[PDB]
Write a protein that binds this ligand. Structure first.
Ligand SMILES: NC(=O)c1ccc[n+]([C@@H]2O[C@H](COP(=O)([O-])OP(=O)(O)OC[C@H]3O[C@@H](n4cnc5c(N)ncnc54)[C@H](O)[C@@H]3O)[C@@H](O)[C@H]2O)c1
Ligand SMILES: [Mg+2]
Ligand SMILES: [Mg+2]
Ligand SMILES: [Mg+2]
Ligand SMILES: [Mg+2]
Ligand code: NA
Ligand code: NA
Ligand code: NA
Ligand code: NA
Lengths: 494, 494, 494, 494
């Protein structure tokens, strides 16, 4: 039961957020944000750059000073604030979901039932961690009392992507705020709206000025300014592998700020011959096509055992052909447009590459509508490991199905990648499930399911899919600076 | 690769161990310890009673005084001491294994390869815990600095059974010593020898006097004296459910000392129709017949799915018939005698009960030799839940095989018990394994295996099979007294 | 800032709470609950006995069945429910505070600003734990996958005292519910009202029927029925050392249910010569007189160094004399009446004992009013260790001041007790503070403060002050049943 | 009790260690390692470069393959191997200490009693962690079973400095091996000898070929090769801030390997007016002069309160003048030479800068001997925050004494630095100690002591002194790659 959306949500926030106030870019420049469903401009947004980031960092540093309201605040109260923010987001759930769809393109039903639900669960999960991430009292040698204080890392720069606007903001703000840090966030230029509105809710919830600062703008400008800043203590980035390298290089070239990266992937979804056919087919479809295929851990490499290959392919093709593409605001729409023209073109280019390299086009392969950035659900059969569409992150509704014979074979082929964000295994066998989940080199291995995220469970990549983990208890590690205090005592006893 | 045993090991220790010295009982009384393989007396052992326990408790209390060598000793050094004890036990491995067999009756090969190996692995594991069981620094509300000190619980009374003499001693000493406690141990009257010799090694290792005290003697005397003592802070008991109740009542009646119990069981071993027949058969055999069937978590209720029942039974009977019973010192012996005459007769009474109640005797059922306490491997088929041999812990080589149809059925029947120490599931199906492991009400659930103990994994019972857990990190909880220190500070900051 | 109270709050709940419904006792019997400020009957309350407890246990067991709404509920949702209950309690904060004062006697201002605040903080803290009390994946030896499930302990019997009605209920419900257990609570016969109203809010919050059941009644009847019940998995008791013993004996005599106890104390408050005089005097007053002296960890033994003894006593006596005693609803009242006539008389008997044993009566010592159960703030000087008022828990506004010379002397004198609930040290010296906090044998050691409780910090006693800990992460241990699952895998790898 | 040293220990190892075998550099080139005490060449050492690192990485990768001896080895056995290595290092303690002194220059007595003792304590500590760094079982939403596997991070490149050759090797090998990783270590060109010999002991201990590989050589060559390698999963570096940046940039430019850094410092040692004069003076001396002043956390900024400044300075100057400089093998020597000519000159240059900037030279200031790299213990008084010697890491026996008035003042001045490795506070006041320890922006804050390291307590820097922590449990974080396994189950229950 999803509330009727407002297909034309009003925009109340489109500037730079510093000290709980709205500012125009120092340059006074603005950039347009487009609605992918029509190709039309929604509104202008302040174009933050280096000078704006500088104002944001100073505000955050000021809010982080010893003795400030944010630093003195009870840990439990930080939890109270996070829950309040969640309550406020829930109050405006219908509006935010609509605005999310307008600027991103994903179906409103999904924005409401999935994106916003996950945002609420993430913030509420971390609210609980606020006063529970204990330090330790250590039984060190000699006559000493030794313990550790889990302090905030400090001024945290957070650069996020456009595929899950609200959710990426939550995954970042949740752990940072729970541990008492201050934030300078750089939202994606393609989807700045929903994040900016949430800043209004952050102010309404009671967060002190400067605790959360959002600077909308481009990457090489605002993004690089944050990564290279001399007064930013830590940076958390989610995006392409290419930019992740630039982020880490910026960190090492500047003040050696701490770094955590959540990059792309080319996750393998392995279907064994003993899998439940109907379930595997539907899950494999979801694994790749979810969120217009714009998911970091998308099952972009569907390995299917030769005994069930033919049947699996027929069913997969049928499902892809029945996948409804249209206006995201229509409750019947399963797939909306791609985020922008750049992604639109990049995906079409990959489809063309797939055709040239010898992959078998089974369905789709072209534009789905003359207005917007809609692409037909595309499925390639008989894909070989050496093919481009088998090695590069397409980030669109383009499925690759590969055939394999043995379990040893598939392990080597699945792990033969520079990526290692996620992986999946579909089987009814206990030993095969354990054998594969142990052998697969990925941050997350789903068994008989896919895209199962939980605020409780860690998520991150192996190899070049990133470093560090987000969500769960692990998501607090990167936002904590450990201090050891060793005190001389008259006589130590157990 | 088992060294030739000394079939008549010399006894060097047979008195009360207090303050790293050997004492006769105050009463000067002694009791005989018998060799179950011949029924002959090995030697006399000091019969400790209340007055002897009192001397041991005072010695322990003195060793636990603030400022004592044991209290001031670095946590890491306690670890060094435990590793030293392990090394000494390894030096005398061949001797201890032989002595273990002589007094307990289990096969020498098993004493050497299993019991002693596990003892070594238990002590070495806990040695590593000595300086790693951290306390916490807590982000409490207000201007305070709050933290916890994990202190030793104090004088720990440890009462152990006779089925695994050396191992039960290790499971008790390892965690207690790693956390800096002092001990007053009451070993079983049937097998006091090996534990007493280890006391010599404890002294040789460098442990301060009074840290470990051992009082051989009977239960209602020495055992009850420890459980009811006004100066014993904690008691850990391993034995029958009947005595466990007595221990807990004694604790409540005395000084409210902390209690942890490891009692009996009637563990169900579930064999699904899709299990590997050969494997399940051999494992089910081991699950019940191990250590003359004198194992707390023995799979005494073998549930077999109707479609594979007949074949499973035929193979089970054949294996039981081929099981070699004889002199424990003979390399070909799989099963030695029962611990003593009391157990010998108790088991025969159960076999008679099984015949009278209608269970089908498939093999064995009687005495295996005219000398010693040897009983033929016995297997009962078509056992029903209401039968005595299906509800009561037999503790002998008596196997119960029950038939079942559905998975929902077996769950209910397996959980329909006052016991809940362990359980096992044999299947190749992922979902069946996960379904059963979650549903079964047991402290340990083995999947496609049985009797897999690891110093790293906890062991304990649900319901009336005990309370608390031993082994792993959990094994330190009961030996730790938590102290909170909350300090007023000028101004708290995150 | 305190809202004007309704000095005559209406009672809406006075029956037995089972399956979210109100029931009369099977016997139809009722008992009167008195207002200690007037000695008049507030109303009648259903007198629950064994048969009523049986209905409660069965309902709880039913709500705990595998596949039930409570068992299947997401852990995070349990957190949501706990936060909802907290919100409902805050909505009715003014009403609950008034009702607390009416039935207990403590000052309304304190009920509102302290009791209810602490209740809200306790529930909100534990709501955050609901989905974060992780189990473990263990690197066990051999080819196995070993892990632990942290399951609910089951049907939890919770028996609470009358000194902090709402708070004791919160301390019990918070951790139990956070971990997925079901509850059968027995509230104190002297103060059943507030807890019963909270049951209504529990139903309003959405908790499934049978998750929380409250049975008002007496101890030897309803209380003993819970402790001795064959289907109660765990019992948590807070009360006298005398009844604690009875509970533990009942547990051992019945089904060996797990037990945690929170008993009395005779907590020492040590004031060193270098302490801040004004601060120590005020805190020492609060340490003992708080909540009409009806506090488990009351600083009933005030040790003062000889060089500051005379001045400390003069100031303490003056503070005691200025302490306003009267109607709890009057904002100027610091101290209300004692809970009932039984306590009233017991305290008067102790004051007489103090006079007879040679303690110097400095002020007070008699009845403060003709109506109600008011006792004058009483101070005894030159108290000796052997005196009864120095060894037994008075639980009234009776202060004992003892003189001491050295720091070594006070450690021995403070530790020479069967109690060990709490302790405190007042000093400006780093070494003295560390020396004492380590040496003191108490569950909580406050430094330069007293009665500082935090939902984040554990609380419990050493020796006969109880066993186990409440609050903090440690508060979840007793409500968790650990299950180890060890699965055989094809080939284990690190 | 120090055994007489062999002042001319024979060198047995001076090549590249790959696959438990000794190899010459592919280029066949060698470099000389000098004895700083005489300026003479000890021996030639294989000069490893990129090609040799490539051989090392491939061997490490091979040893890390799924199914290899190192991967299948029980975690507990990895602990057994670490303890064995520790025992072997202890067997050869006298020899290793002598060789440490010969190549590094530090006093033999210190090498024996401190360096080697700490090495032994580090390895034995981590040996215990091998099978205790548990993963988690998470109570995720929905019908799923979610858990994490704590897997080894992989091929770990470890680059270490020359100030503590053996110890730096222990701090790196202990955690890496405890968690099942493989290593390619690059020891300092100035002190390669001792580490190479330890490789012989690693082979003798039973560690599989390729698990530990050591490549002696220069930084821009061998070091850079490791940091930029496409198949190295993680790099741990200990050295200058300058090279730390190069390492992080190389990591971002190559394969985005994980990075942890342990850089330099300019640690403030604060002496309050109420400190114990004698103690503070002796500890301030040790704080700076330890290990010829070649300590990362050296107290290079001694802040002394004005009221005790003159007395503190007089005593400090007297202690520095009495400090015995000479042959490190002579028992009376407190200070040996600097590690090499480059450091020698760098330190002399800093002393010159101190004289030019206006700092008051109180003692020393020049060369202590005509042979070797000996520098007189130098003390500068009246140092100002803006002076070069007050901002840059000198790494020599040059002490800076600065005067201050208030506690608020010293906090600001102590924190006004790009470094933040450690700090110290000397005071008898509880409040001041807690105020300062909380306020100071440093990885380790010592109270009434200094240079107190424990294998149990974390060590690392804030700001530019590094990132991540070493030692303690935290030391395992960087050598662990978290994997989440989420399995669909029929029906999830608590
Ligand atoms: N430890 C504490 O925090 C605490 C709390 C309250 C009172 N006390 C001590 O207890 C003394 C007496 O007061 P009290 O009568 O209210 O304590 P109590 O132990 O008798 O009552 C506490 C709770 O236990 C229940 N209870 C009583 N008998 C029981 C039994 N036989 N089986 C099961 N439950 C039973 C009572 O009904 C009540 O719910 C006080 O003067 C004080 O010394 C201690
Ligand atoms: Mg880009
Ligand atoms: Mg018995
Ligand atoms: Mg009573
Ligand atoms: Mg260099
Ligand atoms: Na857009
Ligand atoms: Na015997
Ligand atoms: Na009352
Ligand atoms: Na050298």
């Amino acid at each position: 039961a999803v509330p009727a959306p407002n297909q034309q949500p009003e925009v109340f926030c489109n500037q730079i957020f510093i000290n709980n106030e709205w500012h125009d870019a120092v340059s006074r420049k603005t950039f347009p944000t487009v609605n992918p469903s029509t190709g039309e401009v929604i509104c202008q947004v302040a174009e933050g750059d280096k000078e704006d980031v500088d104002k944001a960092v100073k505000a955050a540093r000021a809010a982080f000073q010893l003795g400030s309201p944010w630093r003195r605040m009870d840990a439990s109260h930080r939890g109270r604030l996070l829950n309040r923010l969640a309550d406020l987001i829930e109050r405006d759930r219908t509006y935010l979901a609509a605005l999310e769809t307008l600027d991103n393109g994903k179906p409103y039903v999904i924005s409401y039932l999935v994106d916003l639900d996950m945002v609420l669960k993430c913030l509420r999960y971390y609210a609980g961690w606020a006063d529970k991430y204990h330090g330790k009292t250590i039984p060190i040698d000699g006559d000493f009392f030794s313990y550790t204080r889990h302090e905030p890392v400090g001024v945290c720069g957070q650069i996020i992507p456009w595929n899950f606007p609200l959710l990426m903001q939550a995954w970042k703000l949740g752990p940072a705020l729970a541990t008492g840090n201050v934030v300078v966030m750089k939202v994606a230029e393609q989807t700045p709206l929903t994040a900016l509105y949430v800043a209004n809710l952050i102010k309404e919830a009671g967060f002190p000025p400067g605790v959360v600062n959002i600077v909308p703008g481009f990457g090489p400008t605002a993004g690089a300014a944050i990564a290279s800043h001399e007064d930013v203590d830590k940076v958390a980035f989610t995006g392409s592998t290419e930019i992740g390298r630039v982020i880490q290089v910026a960190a090492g070239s500047s003040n050696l700020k701490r770094v955590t990266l959540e990059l792309g992937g080319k996750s393998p979804n392995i279907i064994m011959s003993d899998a439940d056919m109907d379930w595997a087919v539907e899950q494999a479809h979801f694994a790749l096509f979810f969120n217009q295929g714009q998911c970091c851990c998308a099952g972009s490499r569907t390995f299917v055992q030769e005994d069930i290959y033919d049947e699996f392919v027929e069913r997969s093709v049928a499902r892809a052909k029945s996948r409804v593409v249209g206006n995201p605001f229509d409750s019947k729409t399963e797939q909306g447009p791609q985020v922008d023209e750049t992604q639109f073109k990049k995906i079409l280019g990959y489809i063309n590459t797939g055709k040239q390299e010898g992959a078998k086009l089974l369905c789709g392969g072209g534009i789905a509508a003359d207005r917007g950035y809609f692409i037909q659900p595309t499925v390639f059969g008989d894909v070989q490991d050496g093919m481009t569409i088998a090695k590069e992150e397409i980030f669109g509704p383009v499925m690759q199905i590969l055939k394999f014979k043995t379990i040893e074979e598939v392990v080597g082929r699945a792990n033969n990648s520079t990526y290692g964000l996620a992986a999946a295994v579909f089987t009814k066998d206990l030993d095969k499930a354990n054998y594969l989940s142990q052998a697969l080199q990925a941050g997350t291995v789903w068994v008989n399911c896919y895209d199962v995220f939980g605020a409780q469970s860690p998520f991150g990549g192996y190899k070049m899919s990133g470093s560090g983990r987000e969500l769960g208890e692990y998501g607090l590690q990167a936002y904590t600076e450990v201090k050891t205090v060793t005190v001389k005592v008259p006589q130590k006893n157990s």
